mmCIF file with all atom_site columns, C-alpha atoms in Angstrom:
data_model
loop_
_atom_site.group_PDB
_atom_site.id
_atom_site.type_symbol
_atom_site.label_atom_id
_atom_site.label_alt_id
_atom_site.label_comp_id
_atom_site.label_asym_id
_atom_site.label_entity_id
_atom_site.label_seq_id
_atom_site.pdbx_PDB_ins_code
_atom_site.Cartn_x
_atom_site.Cartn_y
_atom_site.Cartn_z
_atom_site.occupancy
_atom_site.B_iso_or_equiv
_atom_site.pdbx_formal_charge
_atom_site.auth_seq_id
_atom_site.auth_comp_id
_atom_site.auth_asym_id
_atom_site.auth_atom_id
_atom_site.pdbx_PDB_model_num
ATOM 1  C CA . UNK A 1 1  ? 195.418 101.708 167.008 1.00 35.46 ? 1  UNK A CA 1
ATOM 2  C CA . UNK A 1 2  ? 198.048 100.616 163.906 1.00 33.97 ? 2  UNK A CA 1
ATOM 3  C CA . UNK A 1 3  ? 200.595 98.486  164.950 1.00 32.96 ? 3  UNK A CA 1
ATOM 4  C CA . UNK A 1 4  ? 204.536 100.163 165.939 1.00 32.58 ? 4  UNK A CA 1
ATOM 5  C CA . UNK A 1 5  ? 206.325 98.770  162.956 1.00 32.08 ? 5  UNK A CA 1
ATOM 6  C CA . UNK A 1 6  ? 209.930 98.678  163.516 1.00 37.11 ? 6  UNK A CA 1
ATOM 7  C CA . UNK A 1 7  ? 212.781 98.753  160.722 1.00 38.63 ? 7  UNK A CA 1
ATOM 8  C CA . UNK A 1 8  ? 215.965 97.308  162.046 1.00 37.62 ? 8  UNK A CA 1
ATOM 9  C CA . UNK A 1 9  ? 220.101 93.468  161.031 1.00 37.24 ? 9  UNK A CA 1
ATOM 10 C CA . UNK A 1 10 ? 220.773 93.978  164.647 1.00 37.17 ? 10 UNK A CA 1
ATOM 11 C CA . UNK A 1 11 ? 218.738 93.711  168.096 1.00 38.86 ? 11 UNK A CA 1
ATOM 12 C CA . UNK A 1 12 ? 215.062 96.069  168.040 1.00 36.61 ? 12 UNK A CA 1
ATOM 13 C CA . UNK A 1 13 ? 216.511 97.675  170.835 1.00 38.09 ? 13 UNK A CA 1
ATOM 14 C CA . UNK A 1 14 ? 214.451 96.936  173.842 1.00 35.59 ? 14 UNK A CA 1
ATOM 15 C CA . UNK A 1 15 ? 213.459 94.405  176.619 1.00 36.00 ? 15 UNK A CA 1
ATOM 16 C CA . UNK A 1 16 ? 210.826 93.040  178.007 1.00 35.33 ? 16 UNK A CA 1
ATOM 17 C CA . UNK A 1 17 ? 209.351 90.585  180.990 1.00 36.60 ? 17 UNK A CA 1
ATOM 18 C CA . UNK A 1 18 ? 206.800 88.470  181.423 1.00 36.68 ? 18 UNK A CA 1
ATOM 19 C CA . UNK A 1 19 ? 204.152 89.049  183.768 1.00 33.21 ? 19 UNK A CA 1
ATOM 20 C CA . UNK A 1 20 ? 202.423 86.098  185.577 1.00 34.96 ? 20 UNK A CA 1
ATOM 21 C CA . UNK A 1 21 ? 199.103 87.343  185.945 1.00 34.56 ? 21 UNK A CA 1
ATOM 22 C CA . UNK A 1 22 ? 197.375 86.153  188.587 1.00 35.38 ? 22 UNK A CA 1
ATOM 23 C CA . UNK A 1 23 ? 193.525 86.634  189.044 1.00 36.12 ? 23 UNK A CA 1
ATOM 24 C CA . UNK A 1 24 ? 193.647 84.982  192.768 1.00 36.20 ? 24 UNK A CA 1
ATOM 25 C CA . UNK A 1 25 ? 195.578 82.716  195.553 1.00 37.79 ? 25 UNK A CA 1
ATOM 26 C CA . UNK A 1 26 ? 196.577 79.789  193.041 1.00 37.57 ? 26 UNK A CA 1
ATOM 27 C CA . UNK A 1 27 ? 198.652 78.855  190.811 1.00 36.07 ? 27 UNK A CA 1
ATOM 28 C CA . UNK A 1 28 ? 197.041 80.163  187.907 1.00 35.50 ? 28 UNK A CA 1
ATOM 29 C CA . UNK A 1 29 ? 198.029 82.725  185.678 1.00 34.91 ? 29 UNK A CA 1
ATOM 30 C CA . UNK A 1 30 ? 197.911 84.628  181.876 1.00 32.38 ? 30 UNK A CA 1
ATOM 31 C CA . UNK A 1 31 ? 201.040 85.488  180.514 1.00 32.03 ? 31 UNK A CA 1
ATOM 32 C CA . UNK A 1 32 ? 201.717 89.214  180.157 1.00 33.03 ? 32 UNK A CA 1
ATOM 33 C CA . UNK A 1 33 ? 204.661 90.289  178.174 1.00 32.89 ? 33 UNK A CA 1
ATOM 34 C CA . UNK A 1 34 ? 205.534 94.054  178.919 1.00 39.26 ? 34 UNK A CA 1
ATOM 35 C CA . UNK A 1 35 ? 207.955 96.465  177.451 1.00 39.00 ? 35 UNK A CA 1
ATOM 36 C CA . UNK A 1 36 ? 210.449 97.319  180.020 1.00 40.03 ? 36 UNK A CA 1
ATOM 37 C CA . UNK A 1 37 ? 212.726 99.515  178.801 1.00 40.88 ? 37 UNK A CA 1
ATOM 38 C CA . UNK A 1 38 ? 213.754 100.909 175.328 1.00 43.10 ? 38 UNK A CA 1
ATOM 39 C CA . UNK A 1 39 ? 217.405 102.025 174.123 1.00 41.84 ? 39 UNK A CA 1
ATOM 40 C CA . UNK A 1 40 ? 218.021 105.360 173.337 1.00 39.47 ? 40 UNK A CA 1
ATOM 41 C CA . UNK A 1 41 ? 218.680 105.749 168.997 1.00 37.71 ? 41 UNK A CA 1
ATOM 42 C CA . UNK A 1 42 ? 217.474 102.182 168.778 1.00 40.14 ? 42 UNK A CA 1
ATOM 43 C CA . UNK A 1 43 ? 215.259 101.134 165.542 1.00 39.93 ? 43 UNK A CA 1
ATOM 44 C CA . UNK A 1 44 ? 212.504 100.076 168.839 1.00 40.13 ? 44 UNK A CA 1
ATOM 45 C CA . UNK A 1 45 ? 212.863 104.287 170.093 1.00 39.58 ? 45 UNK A CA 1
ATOM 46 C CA . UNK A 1 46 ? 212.386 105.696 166.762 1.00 38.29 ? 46 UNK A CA 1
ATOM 47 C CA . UNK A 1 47 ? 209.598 103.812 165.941 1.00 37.67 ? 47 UNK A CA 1
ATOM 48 C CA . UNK A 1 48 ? 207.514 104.412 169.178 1.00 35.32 ? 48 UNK A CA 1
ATOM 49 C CA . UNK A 1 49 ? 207.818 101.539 171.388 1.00 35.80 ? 49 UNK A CA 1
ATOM 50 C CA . UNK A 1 50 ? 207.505 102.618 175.210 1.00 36.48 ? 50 UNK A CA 1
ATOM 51 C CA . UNK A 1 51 ? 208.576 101.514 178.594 1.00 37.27 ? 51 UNK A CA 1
ATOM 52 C CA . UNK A 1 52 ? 205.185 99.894  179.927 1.00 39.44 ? 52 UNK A CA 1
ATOM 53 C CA . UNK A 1 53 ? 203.680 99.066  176.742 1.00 40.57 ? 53 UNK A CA 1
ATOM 54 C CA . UNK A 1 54 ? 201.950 95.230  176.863 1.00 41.14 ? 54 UNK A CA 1
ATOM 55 C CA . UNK A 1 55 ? 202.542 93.601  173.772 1.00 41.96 ? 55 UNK A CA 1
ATOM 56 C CA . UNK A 1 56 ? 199.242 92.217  172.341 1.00 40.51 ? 56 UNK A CA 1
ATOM 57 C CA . UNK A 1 57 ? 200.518 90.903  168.624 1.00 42.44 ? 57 UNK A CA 1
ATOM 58 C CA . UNK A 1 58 ? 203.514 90.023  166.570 1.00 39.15 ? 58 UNK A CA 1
ATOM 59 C CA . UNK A 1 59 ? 203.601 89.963  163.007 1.00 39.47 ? 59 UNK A CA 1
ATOM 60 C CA . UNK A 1 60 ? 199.619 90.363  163.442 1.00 34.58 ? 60 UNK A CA 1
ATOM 61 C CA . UNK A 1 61 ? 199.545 86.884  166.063 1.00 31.79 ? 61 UNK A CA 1
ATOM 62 C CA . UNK A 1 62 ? 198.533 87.145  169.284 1.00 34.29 ? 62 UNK A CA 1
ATOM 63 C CA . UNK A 1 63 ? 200.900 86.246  171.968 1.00 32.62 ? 63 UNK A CA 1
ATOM 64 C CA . UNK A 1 64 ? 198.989 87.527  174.851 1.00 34.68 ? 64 UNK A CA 1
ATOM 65 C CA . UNK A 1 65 ? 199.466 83.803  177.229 1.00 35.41 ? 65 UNK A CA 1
ATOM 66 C CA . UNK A 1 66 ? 202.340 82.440  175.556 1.00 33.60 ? 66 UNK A CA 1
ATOM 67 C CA . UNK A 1 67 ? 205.441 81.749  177.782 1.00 31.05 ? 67 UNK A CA 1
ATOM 68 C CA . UNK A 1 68 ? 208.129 84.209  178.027 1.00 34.39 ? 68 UNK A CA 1
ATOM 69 C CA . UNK A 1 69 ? 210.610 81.978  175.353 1.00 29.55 ? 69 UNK A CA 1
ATOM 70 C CA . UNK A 1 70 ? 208.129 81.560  173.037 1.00 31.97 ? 70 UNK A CA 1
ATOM 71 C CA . UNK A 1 71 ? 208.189 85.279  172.820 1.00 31.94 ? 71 UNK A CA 1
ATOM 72 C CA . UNK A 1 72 ? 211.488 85.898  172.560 1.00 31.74 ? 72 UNK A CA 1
ATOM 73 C CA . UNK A 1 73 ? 211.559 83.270  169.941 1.00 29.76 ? 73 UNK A CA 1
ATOM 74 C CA . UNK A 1 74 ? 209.336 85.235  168.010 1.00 29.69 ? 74 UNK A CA 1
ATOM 75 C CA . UNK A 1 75 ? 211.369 88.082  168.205 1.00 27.78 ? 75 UNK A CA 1
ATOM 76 C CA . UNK A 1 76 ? 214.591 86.234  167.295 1.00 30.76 ? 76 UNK A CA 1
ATOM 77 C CA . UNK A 1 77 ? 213.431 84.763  164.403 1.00 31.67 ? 77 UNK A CA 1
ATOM 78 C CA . UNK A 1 78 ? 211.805 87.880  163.154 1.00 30.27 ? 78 UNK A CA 1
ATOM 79 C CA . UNK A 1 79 ? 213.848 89.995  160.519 1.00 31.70 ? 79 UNK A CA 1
ATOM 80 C CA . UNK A 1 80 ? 214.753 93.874  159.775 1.00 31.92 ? 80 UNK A CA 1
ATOM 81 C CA . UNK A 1 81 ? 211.180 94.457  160.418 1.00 32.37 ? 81 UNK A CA 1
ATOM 82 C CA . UNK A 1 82 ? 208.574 93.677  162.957 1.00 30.47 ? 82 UNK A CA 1
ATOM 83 C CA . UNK A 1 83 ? 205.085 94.823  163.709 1.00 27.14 ? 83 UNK A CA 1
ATOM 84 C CA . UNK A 1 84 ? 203.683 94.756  166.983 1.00 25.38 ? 84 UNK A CA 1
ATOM 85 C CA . UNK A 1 85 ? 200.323 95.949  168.615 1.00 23.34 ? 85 UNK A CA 1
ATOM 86 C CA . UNK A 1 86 ? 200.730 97.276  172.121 1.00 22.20 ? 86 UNK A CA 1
ATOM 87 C CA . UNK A 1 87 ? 198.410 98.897  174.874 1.00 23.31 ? 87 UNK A CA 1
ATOM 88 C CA . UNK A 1 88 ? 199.218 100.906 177.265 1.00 23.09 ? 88 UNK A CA 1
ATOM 89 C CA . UNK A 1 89 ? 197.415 102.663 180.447 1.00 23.96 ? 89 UNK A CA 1
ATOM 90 C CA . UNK A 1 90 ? 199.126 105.708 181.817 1.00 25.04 ? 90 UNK A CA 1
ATOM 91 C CA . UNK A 1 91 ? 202.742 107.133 180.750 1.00 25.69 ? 91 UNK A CA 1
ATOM 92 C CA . UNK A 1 92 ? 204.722 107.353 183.359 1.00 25.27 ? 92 UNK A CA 1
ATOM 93 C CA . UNK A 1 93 ? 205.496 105.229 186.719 1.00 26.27 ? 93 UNK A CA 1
ATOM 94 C CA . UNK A 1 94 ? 204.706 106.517 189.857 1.00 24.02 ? 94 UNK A CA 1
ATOM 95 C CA . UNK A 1 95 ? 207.621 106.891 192.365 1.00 24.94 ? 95 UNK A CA 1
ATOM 96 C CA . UNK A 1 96 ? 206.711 106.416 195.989 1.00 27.35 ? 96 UNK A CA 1
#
């Protein structure tokens, strides 16, 4: 898949968290940084970028395991454009 590259001088337009993936009962994790939302007319909506999409690169480095700063570092100190490659499973939430 290309990477979502984003034209912006302000903010992308979105947030994000950062997932502590565990794998079992300690204190162990991966770092998972997931789109969580996306603002409507933002340069991050036009683009592509979607609610639940895990951010694998930035500017073509991978930041899958890095620390949830370090990430939004990397964003900061990005300019009017950015490239990221994202994955994502299905589309929607489920509501229960």
């Amino acid at each position: 898949r290309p990477p979502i590259v984003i034209h912006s001088g302000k903010k992308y337009g979105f947030s994000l968290r950062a997932i502590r993936v565990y794998m079992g009962d300690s204190d162990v994790y991966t770092v998972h940084h997931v789109v969580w939302s996306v603002e409507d007319g933002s340069p991050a909506q036009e683009a592509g970028l979607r609610a639940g999409d895990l951010i694998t690169h930035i500017n073509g480095e991978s930041v899958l395991g890095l620390v949830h700063m370090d990430v939004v570092e990397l964003l900061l100190k990005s300019g009017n454009k950015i490239s990221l490659r994202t994955t994502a499973l299905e589309n929607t939430e489920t509501s229960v």
